[PDB]
Structures are given as structure tokens and as C-alpha cells.
From a paper:
Lenacapavir (LEN) is a long-acting, highly potent [name]-1 capsid (CA) inhibitor. The evolution of viral variants under the genetic pressure of LEN identified [name], [name], and [name]/[name] CA substitutions as the main resistance associated mutations (RAMs). Here, we determined high-resolution structures of CA hexamers containing these RAMs in the absence and presence of LEN. High-resolution co-crystal structures of LEN in a complex with cross-linked CA hexamers revealed that the inhibitor binds in a hydrophobic pocket formed by two adjacent CA subunits.
Residue numbers in the entry:
A (entry chain C), B (entry chain C), C (entry chain C), D (entry chain C), E (entry chain C), F (entry chain C): 1 to 219
The structure:
Amino acid sequence: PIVQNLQGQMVHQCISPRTLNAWVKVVEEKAFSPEVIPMFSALSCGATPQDLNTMLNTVGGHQAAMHMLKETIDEEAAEWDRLHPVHAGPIAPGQMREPRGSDIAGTTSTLQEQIGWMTHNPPIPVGEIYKRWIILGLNKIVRMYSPTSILDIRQGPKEPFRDYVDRFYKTLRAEQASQEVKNAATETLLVQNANPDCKTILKALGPGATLEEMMTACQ
Amino acid sequence: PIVQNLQGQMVHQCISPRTLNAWVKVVEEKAFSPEVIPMFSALSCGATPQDLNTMLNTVGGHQAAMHMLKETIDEEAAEWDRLHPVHAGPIAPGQMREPRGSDIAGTTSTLQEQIGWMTHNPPIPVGEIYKRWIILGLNKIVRMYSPTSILDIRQGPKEPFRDYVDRFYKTLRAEQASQEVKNAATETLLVQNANPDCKTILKALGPGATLEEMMTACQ
Amino acid sequence: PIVQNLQGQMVHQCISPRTLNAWVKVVEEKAFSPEVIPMFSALSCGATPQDLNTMLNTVGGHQAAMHMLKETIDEEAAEWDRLHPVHAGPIAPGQMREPRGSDIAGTTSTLQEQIGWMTHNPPIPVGEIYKRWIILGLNKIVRMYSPTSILDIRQGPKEPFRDYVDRFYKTLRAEQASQEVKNAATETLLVQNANPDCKTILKALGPGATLEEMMTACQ
Amino acid sequence: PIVQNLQGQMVHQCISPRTLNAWVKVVEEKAFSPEVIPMFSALSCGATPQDLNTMLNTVGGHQAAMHMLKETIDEEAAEWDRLHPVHAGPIAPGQMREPRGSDIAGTTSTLQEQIGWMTHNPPIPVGEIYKRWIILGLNKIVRMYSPTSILDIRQGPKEPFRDYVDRFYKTLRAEQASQEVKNAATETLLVQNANPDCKTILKALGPGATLEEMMTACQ
Amino acid sequence: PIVQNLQGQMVHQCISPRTLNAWVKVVEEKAFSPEVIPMFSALSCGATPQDLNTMLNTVGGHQAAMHMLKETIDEEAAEWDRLHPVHAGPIAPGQMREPRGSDIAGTTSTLQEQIGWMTHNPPIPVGEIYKRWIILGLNKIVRMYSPTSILDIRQGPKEPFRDYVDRFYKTLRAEQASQEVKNAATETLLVQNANPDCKTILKALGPGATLEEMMTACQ
Amino acid sequence: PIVQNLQGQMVHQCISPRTLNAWVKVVEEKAFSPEVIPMFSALSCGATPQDLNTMLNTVGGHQAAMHMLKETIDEEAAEWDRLHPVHAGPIAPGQMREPRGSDIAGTTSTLQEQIGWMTHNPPIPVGEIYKRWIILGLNKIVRMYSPTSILDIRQGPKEPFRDYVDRFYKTLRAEQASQEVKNAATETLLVQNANPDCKTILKALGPGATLEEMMTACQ
Ligand SMILES: [Cl-]
Ligand SMILES: [Cl-]
Ligand SMILES: [Cl-]
Ligand SMILES: [Cl-]
Ligand SMILES: [Cl-]
Ligand SMILES: [Cl-]
Ligand SMILES: [Cl-]
Ligand SMILES: [Cl-]
Ligand SMILES: [Cl-]
Ligand SMILES: [Cl-]
Ligand SMILES: [Cl-]
Ligand SMILES: [Cl-]
Ligand SMILES: [Cl-]
Ligand SMILES: [Cl-]
Ligand SMILES: [Cl-]
Ligand SMILES: [Cl-]
Ligand SMILES: [Cl-]
Ligand SMILES: [Cl-]
Ligand SMILES: [Cl-]
Ligand SMILES: [Cl-]
Ligand SMILES: [Cl-]
Ligand SMILES: [Cl-]
Ligand SMILES: [Cl-]
Ligand SMILES: [Cl-]
Ligand SMILES: [Cl-]
Ligand SMILES: [Cl-]
Ligand SMILES: [Cl-]
Ligand SMILES: [Cl-]
Ligand SMILES: [Cl-]
Ligand SMILES: [Cl-]
């Protein structure tokens, strides 16, 4: 990654074996669960496009998802080239060439060029731009591999309300619905999909009840 | 986190894989036991709002609690906006804009802005302010998930007084009662809920006896 | 902890996940064995009062001992206030306020104030003062939880003298007797509690024999 | 490796025990799977030719592949000598001698000479040149040890399309075919080798369908 | 330990949790085998007397040996006081007081005083002096706990000569005999204690044969 | 080891617990396999003679080999003294005394003297000179403990050619034959010791075939 050393200058460091192993293990253990994406974003803190390609390519298996990830990366790279056409001309002695879509993806750019963009003033954060493309493609993989729909998450007649809400927002997180549909899930599906005994209690609670108040009422 | 390097300047460092893994493991092993909160506060030492959101979002499962945590965060963010209304106007070339409630929660603020507030002179510690909101919501989760009331912790007729006091303050810690009710628990419930043999000995001890004196007397 | 960086200035560092995990594990594995106290003192090297409270509060269970530890801390804090009454008045622009007993315990003082005392010239080592209070309370827990008295440690008729001396000083260490009673344990109880065959040999050795000479004679 | 320290100067560091152990373990666990090559490239970040020879020589077993790796290294070293014949003459007091093919492979060059080339201005990156030779030979080992041909990867009549695509691109990755043959694998073999039910659905999808659209259609 | 930082000045660092755990584990696993002593010397590199007492006191059990270690430390401390009687008088503003025997053992000296002696110019290496006393006492424990004498290590009639020499020098190492008795062990006891078949071959080899030549001859 | 810090000056660092443990473990797991020697050379990067003696002495067991290692060290030390007789005379205030053979082995030299030679200008690399002696003795141990001769490595009638070549160069590596005998092993013994079916195919391949071509032909 490109990290600021203990002197105030942005320099390159090699990706650590701890970072490499941590990313491989979480994919082996959790696959494409929703919480893997924030783990990927944190383990790739300050990562160059080369570091991002390293983390992706060190993953063995799940190649169906890894190839869906490449298509999303190519789609975003093509959109970047449509919005940022590179202007031909010799690069000034102290400047950097404009990055193409494949340059941000680390496939047509060298590490020195990636360091040059990320450490420029003002900097071109090709690592963070590439990471946005990767996380976008990873989120589509999480939704595709989500097995259960939120409509099928219903509380059992003897299931504790706490365990049911655990399954509810676990499923809703993988579905990655819109903000409007997710915010009202507390007042709509969570009450509708509860068992008759708890739904009766939640009805007498009235609208605008917090999740803490709803879980307390059905305990 | 924002850490002072070995030169006296506050700079940003990426959250370490050791920190990321340590927080995920303690939640997998201890869930929301009371001692998880001081572990979260220590692992998030100097953490930015982005680091705090990272630690929370890397947690898979327990989504009922994680969503109760979001509501507490939104409640505190709304209270911050009520007490600190942002004043409109162009930001001076060397100053920072006033953070909104969602800016402290890391949802509407960039890392550069969070670094700008935390490294300002005087600094706006949005990371520590956000951590106060998170710990507040985490403490409410510990109380809700506390299974046993302190009134039901009674010493068995053959249970050693040491094991009974272990269960007593373990339950009392999760209940997180007031300081007045918790301080007098030594002289009130701890003696009342003891078995007849030890309660007789603790009665002859008289008021004002230390826990060391009470445990010694019933050994 | 407050550590001297690689430039000669005392600055604050966050407590490491390795330090946090090491202290939690040794309590889970060894509880309050005598050797846990030097491990606590080493793991808390240069620790601030906040770091000390962190290590104590991350311990789940053993709450009977942890509450006995709080009473010892409060007793020492009250003794500190009796010997150091804070003088009222505005603090000079470059000075620090006098710490109260609860300030050294980290309950009424901020981290910045603890850094201010520990890095002062001359420094007020509130971390080492607090650690003395904690170790004092921890030593009382080791004695209370010591199951066997030194008077009951006797060598078996067929027990090797080496194993008996292992049990002897293991028990004596947890008892934490006075220096006078512990120094003469070599010449008094260790010989008296040996089996008849080894006691006969140790009698012919004469007074002033080293433990190496006594163990060799009964081999 | 040759790493830039926290002062802006390229200096040598010893290869860490974490790096040494991580490379030995991944070979013990994954042998010559395709994802081992990006792991080798990352673990050898900034590595000198001596570090590269160290990582290769610490591998016990797989000596058939390790000897095939030596022949590829010798072939590339001979090609380097054909394109870069060293010019005889005394080296200037501040310059470096031209590296031979065996000098880049670390067999006829000292560490000081490798540091001299890598830290030169302009630098001769003998470590990255050697790594290109090693990765080239490692890729030939991956293809040779690939057990299954892509033509034999066909979807079962009841096999889910997701698992079939997992096996498809896993096999195709080890085959390491040309870019033209690999890019069209989505529109050609992946549909041809699917079961009759999914092939019918993929036919009605039409050409130019993304892998995300194809996997969704056969779910 | 007192380590030279990355600026050329000798400063104090806290003993690491890795060092603390490594010393406790090797004692739990190997007890007082001969190879534990060089491990103790390496783990205590640059250690202060406080660090040395920390490592010794973190050891639970083996208290018979740990108390024999204290007597050896007191014997050496008394010998130091006999050779270095402290001269009374006020210490100059830039000097250090002469260390007593108990000051080197870390029992009557503070860490600041130990840092003052070790970082003095010229330095008083109280840590290395104390370590010599500890290693001296540890070596006496290794000899006492050595179960087998070198005279009883004889090669079996069917035992391979390699395994017999393994047992020979393993026993001889724990005995820690004199240099004269240990150097000639190759030409004396190693041949005398071999089986009749190998002793016949070693006799025809003649004097002055290396261990490599002796092991080859009896293979 | 003597490592260049982050300021361009060669200073001493204590050998890390990770380095100490890594060397002990690889000897416990792999003994004296050929790949242990490059692991020893890497773990001892920049090691002083004291660090080298530390790594050797921390090895418990295998004392037959460890004593054969001492004789090789003494042989090389005697050869060093024969080629470098120390010249008597007082050492200049800024110079270092000439190292004897036992000084390079770390037995008659202090750490300060070893630092003085290694950090001299020009430096006397006593650590690398000692390491050459150790690796020389370690290689003789690998050959002695090699159980199988290369002449006895023959391909089974149903053994895959890949597994046979694995056993071939594994045995040849431990034998550590000459370069001339090892280079022609591809064209001589590897074909001669193959089964009749593969030997027939390798005969029709003709001379000068690469190992990749030979393994492909017998697959
Ligand atoms: Cl690492
Ligand atoms: Cl995987
Ligand atoms: Cl994310
Ligand atoms: Cl450019
Ligand atoms: Cl609940
Ligand atoms: Cl880490
Ligand atoms: Cl979890
Ligand atoms: Cl807390
Ligand atoms: Cl701003
Ligand atoms: Cl008790
Ligand atoms: Cl850590
Ligand atoms: Cl515990
Ligand atoms: Cl202590
Ligand atoms: Cl103040
Ligand atoms: Cl004994
Ligand atoms: Cl390491
Ligand atoms: Cl292997
Ligand atoms: Cl690669
Ligand atoms: Cl040169
Ligand atoms: Cl799917
Ligand atoms: Cl550590
Ligand atoms: Cl132990
Ligand atoms: Cl030693
Ligand atoms: Cl003094
Ligand atoms: Cl042998
Ligand atoms: Cl370490
Ligand atoms: Cl071993
Ligand atoms: Cl080597
Ligand atoms: Cl000298
Ligand atoms: Cl093959």
C-alpha cells in the first residue's frame, strides 16, 4: 500500500503476509457473506491497484464470482474511459499521464505509475477508484448468492423474537435493497412476518416504536 | 486510526489485520458479554469514524443488536444536530466545516474530513464522540441480552460463598444498574441472597464489612 | 502506554491487541496463580491508568476478586487523598493539577490529564502509582484463593524430595508470608515436614545447608 | 528485500520469518494451484535475487517442478546474455558492472552487487527481472500439472449452473490459454458444455449476455 | 530491554508479550533441558535486571529450582559486594551510585537506576552481570536434574551408532563436565561404550579419528 | 543481527523471538532435510557470530550432528588461523584487532568486538564467514543422513513419471554431488532408471531434451 511513513511523506510499502493471509482466510471461511466486503475494504486500506489485483488473484476457487467481478470491473473501466478520454501529448517532466480505465484496474499500468498517481499533488486515487469498482462487483455477488428472500423470513410460532430478528436483518443485509425499502422494514415486514402472539403485542405498541421497544415487548 | 508517529505529528494509519481479527473473534466467542465493551474501546484506540464503522460492519450475525446499535447512533446524531446546528458559509482556507451528526457517524463524511477534524488545533474528536455513541448503544444491548435478574441470584445451601459472589457481580455487571443501587449491593442483596448459614455469619459481622471480610467469614 | 519513541520524547501509544489478548488469556488459564502478578506487571509496562482499567475490565468472570480489587483501589485512593489534599486554585498555563485518588485510578481523569502527569517534568507517575495499588489488591486475592497452608505440605513416605520441595515453595509463594518467616522456611518447615528417611539425612547435614545441598542429600 | 525506509532511501532488509513461513506453507497446502503464483509475487515484493532463490530453495519436495523451474531460469538467463553482452572494462568508481544472466538469477552475483543494481540511479531491477523469469517457469508448471482439460468440463444434468461455472473457470485458469480463446469462453464453451435444460435457456438469452445474466437465467 | 533505537541512542523499551510468552512456553515444554539456557539468554537480549526478574518470576511451578536459583544469585551478589564495596558520599549531578549486589539483582534498585547504569558512559552492564549470575544458577539446575550419567550411556547390541551418539552427547551436555573431560570423550568413552561390533571397527580406525569418520565406519 | 536502521547506520538488534522459534521448529519438523539449510541461512540474515551460536545451541537433540558441526567449525577456524596469523601489537584507538578462528566462531570474542568487525569500514564480515563454516558443516550432515543413493532411485513399472522424478531429484539433492555429475543426471540416470515403457519413449526423444519435454512424453 501507499502509506505515510513516520516523516510525513507518502511512500510505498509491500503488502504484508498478515494482510495476504487474512484476506485468503476470510474468503475460505465466509465466502461472500455481507460482512466480507467491509473486511476487504479494511484489509485493502491504502492499497494500490496492484495490491487490489493481488488480493483478488490470491483467491482460489469461487471463479464464477471472480469472473463476474472482472466483468463489473471492465464495465466501470469502460464508463471511466467514456467520461475521461485521455488527451494525447508528451507528458511534462513533473506530471503524470491521464489514467485509462485499464490503468486504474492495474492491468495496463505499472506500480511506479500507480505510485505516481496516488502520490501526486493533487493525487489521482486510482486505488480508491478501483476499490469502488471492486466493492460494487462484490456487492452484486452477495445479492446473487443470497439464498433466501426477505419475504420468506417469518417468525416461528415458538421461535423467540430475538432469533427471528437476527434472521430478518441477516437476510435483508444480503439482499441489499434500497434505503427506502430497508428503513421501513422495521415498521412493515418485521411486524407482518412475526408470529400471531408477537404481532398482536406489536400492534398495540403503535407506530414509531424502536427495535429496542419491539424486542422488549415480545420477550 | 489517527496515531502520533515517532516524530510528534498526528497522522493516519490503516487499521491492522490484528485489530480487525481480534474484534471479530471476541464477538464470535463472547457475543455481548459485559467485558466485550472495554475490549471494543481498547481495540478502537484512536479510531476514526471510518474505523469504528469498519469494526461494526465486519461483524456477521447478531444483526438484531447491530440494528439496535444503529438506532442509538441515529438518536445521538440527532441530539448532536439539535445542540450543534451547522452554520452555512464558505469554509476558510485553513479551517474545517462543522460536523453534522451523520458526519461523526462516518456516513456522510470522508476520511480526509475525519482526519481534518481529529488533527485540527483545537481538535474535534469525532472518533471519540462516535465511540461514546457506540458504547452507549452497546451497553443497552448488554442489558437487554442479560438473561438473569440480580434478585434471582441466591446462594445455594451447599454452594461456596466464593462461587455465589462470582455469579452475583457477574449478573449485576450485565444489569448495569445505577451507582447508588450497585454500591449498596454489598451490604444489601449480597447478604440477603446468601444461604442461612452464611447469612447468620454475615449478620454477626456487622455493617461496613468489606467484601474481603465477608468472603473470609463464609469460608 | 506512554512510551519513548525513537526520538527521545515520551508519547502515547494505543495498547496493542497482543497485549490485550495476552492478559485475557493468562487470566483464563491461570486465574490468580502467583505468577500471574509479574505477568500483569510486565504486560502493563508503561501503562496509563486508562490502560490499567482496560486490562482489569476486559476480564470476564472472577468478579468476586475483581470487586475485592476495587475496594483495595478505593482504600489506597482514600489514603492518597489523606496524604495529598489538592490545593484549590487556577492551574498555571504550563502546569498540571494535583491528581486526586480517583484521578490516579483513571475514573475521574482523562487520558490527556494522565499523559500530562506521566510526561511532566518532573513526572507524576500515576500509572505506576495505580499499578502499585492494583498489585497490592491482586496479592490479597492470591492469598485468599490459596487453598493449602504451608503447614499441611508434608513429604510423602515414597515421594521424591524434589517433588516435595516443588509443592513446598509453590504453596509458600501463594501464602506470601513475611520475609523472616519465608527465609527460615529452608531451615525450619522444609526439614520438619520431610519424611523420616530424608529428615534423618538433613539432620546429619547440619544447619546452614543450601537447598542444593539438601536436595542432593535426599536424592 | 530492498525497501524504502521511513526516510526516503532504498535500503536492504532481511527477509522476515513471517515471509519465509508463509511461502513454505502455501506450497505445502496448495502445491502449484494457479492462485499460488500471485501469492509468490506478493510475498516476494521488493525481493532481491538472493531472496527469490531463498524462497525457491526453502521448498522441500516438488523437485521435478523445481528443476523444471531451473531450466526455464537458465533459458531466460541465456536469452538475457544474448540481448545484453557485457562490455569488458574497469568499472567506474561510482558505477555498476553490467549483470549477466546468472547475475540476475543470483547465482554468480553477491548481495552487495544486487543491492547496487536495484538501488542504482537509474536502477537495474534484477529482482523484478528474475521474478519475471520465475513466474514464467511457475506458470508452465501450473499448466503441466493441470489434470483436466477445459473440453471435459461439462455441466451435470442435475448440477447447479453455479457449481459448473466454478469448475469451468477453475480449469480454464490452470490451462492458461490465450486471451482470445479465454475471452470467448463465456459465449462458446460455457454454453456448449452446459446441460440441455440450461443450454436451452442460454440460447434464448441471445449473444452478448453477461455471466451475471447467464447465471441468473439458469438458477 | 535497553535497546538502541533507530537514531543511535540507548533507550528503554517494554518487554514484549511475544518475549514474555516465549519464555513461559519453553519452560512449560522443555523444563530445564540444556537448550533452554541459550534460549533464555537470547530472549533476555539487552534485558534490564527488572526484565530478568520478570522472566524468572513469570514461571509458575519448578519452585525448587527457582529457589535454588535465588541462592546462587545471592551468593554471587555477596561476592560482588566483597569485591566492590560501595563508597559513601553524595553522587555527582551527572554520575551514578555504585551498584550493590542486590542492586544488580534488581531487588534494591529502580528501573531508572538500572537504565542509568546500563546507559552510562562508560556503562555498568548490570543486566549482563545479573544474567551471568542467573545462567550460572540455571546451569547448576541442569546438572542436578540430569537423570543419567555419561558412564551409563552404552550402545545397544543392535542400536545404530547414530542413535547411540545422539544419546551420548545429549547426556554429556546435561552433565556439563570440564573441557578436558568433554573434549576427550570422542576418543575415550564414546568408543569404550560402543557395542563390540562397532568398537572393533573404531579400534582399527586408529586414534585421532573425527566423529564424522567414526559414524561413517559404524554405519 | 547487525541491521541498517531507518537512518543509514549499521546497528545491532536483538534476535527476535519469531526468529528463535522459527529455527527451533524447522529442526524439530524437518531435521536435516536439504531445504533446512536455506532456511537457516535466511533466518540468520545479518546474524552475528553470537546469533549463529545461539541458533545452533537452542537446538535440543541431534547432538551427534551438532558435534560434527563443531568439528567442521574448528577445522575451518584452524584453516583461518593458518591463512591469517594475528600480528601482535597495540590496537590503534580507532581500529579493531585481527580476528582469530575462534573469534569468528564467537567463542573467544565479545559481541562488542563482533559489532566492531561487522560495522568496520571496510568491514570484516565475521558473521558471514562463520555462516559459511556452519553451512559447510551442515551440508556434510545432510549427505551423511541421506538414506538412499541416487543409483537406487528407479521408476516403478506402474509409477507415474512425475512421482519418480520427484523422488529422483529429492534424493540427488541430499547427495549433493558435483556439478558435472548433477547436470548430466537429466540425460543419464533419469532415463536409465525409468521403467521400460517410459525409457522407450525417452529414447525416441533424442538427446538434449528438456525435463519439461521428458515429463510430457511419459505422461
Ligand atoms: Cl506480517
Ligand atoms: Cl476459497
Ligand atoms: Cl464496504
Ligand atoms: Cl507518466
Ligand atoms: Cl431480547
Ligand atoms: Cl498486523
Ligand atoms: Cl458473530
Ligand atoms: Cl468501556
Ligand atoms: Cl472542510
Ligand atoms: Cl474465598
Ligand atoms: Cl499487535
Ligand atoms: Cl476469565
Ligand atoms: Cl510483581
Ligand atoms: Cl490540568
Ligand atoms: Cl534433585
Ligand atoms: Cl516476523
Ligand atoms: Cl512442499
Ligand atoms: Cl502473478
Ligand atoms: Cl560492480
Ligand atoms: Cl447463482
Ligand atoms: Cl508482541
Ligand atoms: Cl512451568
Ligand atoms: Cl548460554
Ligand atoms: Cl544514582
Ligand atoms: Cl550416520
Ligand atoms: Cl517477535
Ligand atoms: Cl530437535
Ligand atoms: Cl544455503
Ligand atoms: Cl579490539
Ligand atoms: Cl507431468
